[PDB]
Design a protein around this nucleic acid. Sequence first.
RNA 1: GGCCAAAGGCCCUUUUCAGGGCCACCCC
Length: 71
Amino acid sequence: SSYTEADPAILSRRQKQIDYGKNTAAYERYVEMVPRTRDHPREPNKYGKYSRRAFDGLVKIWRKSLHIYDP
RNA sequence: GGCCAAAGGCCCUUUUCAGGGCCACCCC
Ligand SMILES: [Ca+2]
Ligand SMILES: [Ca+2]
Ligand SMILES: [Ca+2]
């Protein structure tokens, strides 16, 4: 119950997926939230012990959730 | 420590609110 991912391979791939998400306009238009809840869209911990599907699963849900953030 | 979200095990891509691959489970 305490793990930090070391594999540079895994961390890059995961960073990329995250970087993608921040590069969206929805994330830009998320200057309207003070660190908040879990009902919000929070980027997955890249350092978390996660399975491949698990992390990808989270990321999918992350990006979708983002889209609540622009008309 | 535990519990939850996510999660079949991995793998590719800016088709990325997305598309795909291998294996496994299923239906034998
Ligand atoms: Ca679940
Ligand atoms: Ca599932
Ligand atoms: Ca399946």
